[PDB]
Amino acid sequence: GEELFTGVVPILVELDGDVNGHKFSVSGEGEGDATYGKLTLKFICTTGKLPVPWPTLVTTLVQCFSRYPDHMKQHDFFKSAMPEGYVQERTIFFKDDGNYKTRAEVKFEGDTLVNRIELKGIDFKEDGNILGHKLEYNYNSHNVYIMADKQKNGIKVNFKIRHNIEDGSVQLADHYQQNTPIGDGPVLLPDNHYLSTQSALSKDPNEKRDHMVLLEFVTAGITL
């Protein structure tokens, strides 16, 4: 599965969402170069205006593109599940607000790495930070904690995202994630470790559709 990521791999992302009954779709295209832990993607809201802030969707919108140091290669669950793929489920709890529940499949379709996602958001406040579009268009760096989930033959991941608001407060988004293989082939169950992630958000000055350009670098690390 690691051999599939030695070069530049095209990526396709499709999200079908519904948040407090607001339906929307997002499509994304770009490419990933896992040797450098690098992702380059452009996402479009194909249904018109996106009803939630772009930053709230970043985690949902392919951890197989992380750079795993040579010394940690035995801990790369994400690549090991390929090409058959993995199921990625989350609940994201927005503090003092609603939650997203997502289910995605990440796998190859021919040469393309595809991330197909369904998202449902419930219990959001209609003039809160999410539905009221009060989050800054930026993104902090942080560490993602990966643990084996031996019983489920997969991993559990927990992490908190802090979305900056212009008063100097943050909107917390607490993530609980599970990943399981689609195939029944062998996978790598890791020891506890983390992914250091950084994300830069931007706009295409020639793009009239509601969109997000995203550049991300991710490198694993482990404590000895």
Domains plus CATH for the chain? 1-224 (2.40.155.10)
Residue in the structure block whose two tokens are 């595809």: 114
- Solved with: X-ray
CA atoms within 13 A of residue 28's CA, in its CB half-sphere: 30
- Looking only at the bridges linking them, the beta strands covering 86-94 and 99-109 are antiparallel
Is residue 100 within 8 Å of 171, Cβ to Cβ? no
- The residues with which 43 forms a beta bridge, in sequence order, are 28, 212
Q: In Å, how far from its chain's centre is CA 40?
A: 13
Contact 90, 102 (CB under 8 A): yes
Tell me how far apart the alpha carbons of residues 31 and 200 are, in angstroms, rounded to a whole number. 15
100 Cβ contact partners less than 8 Å away, ≥ 6 residues apart: 19, 56, 60, 90, 91, 92, 94, 119, 120, 121
By CB atoms closer than 10 A (0-12, 13-18, 19+), residue 213 is middle
| Phi–psi pair at 133, nearest 5 degrees | 60, 55
Residue 7's Cα: distance from chain center in Å? 21
33 neighbors 90 (Cβ within 8 angstroms)? no
Evaluate whether 77 touches 2 at the Cβ level (below 8 Å): no
Q: What is the DSSP string of the chain?
A: -GGGGSS-EEEEEEEEEEETTEEEEEEEEEEEEGGGTEEEEEEEETTSS-SS-GGGGTTT--GGGSBPPGGGGGG-HHHHTTTT-EEEEEEEEETTS-EEEEEEEEEEETTEEEEEEEEEEES--TTSTTTTT-B-S----EEEEEEEEGGGTEEEEEEEEEEEBTTS-EEEEEEEEEEEESSSS--PPPPSEEEEEEEEEE--TT--SSEEEEEEEEEEE---
User: What is the bridge-based pairing of β-strands 9-19 and 112-122?
Assistant: parallel
Count the Cβ atoms, other than its own, within 10 Å of residue 193: 19
Cβ burial 87-108 (10 Å sphere, 16+ → b, else e): bbebebbbeebbbbebebebbb
Interior/surface letters 160-180, b for 16+ CB within 10 angstroms, e for the rest:
ebebbeeeeebbebebebbbb
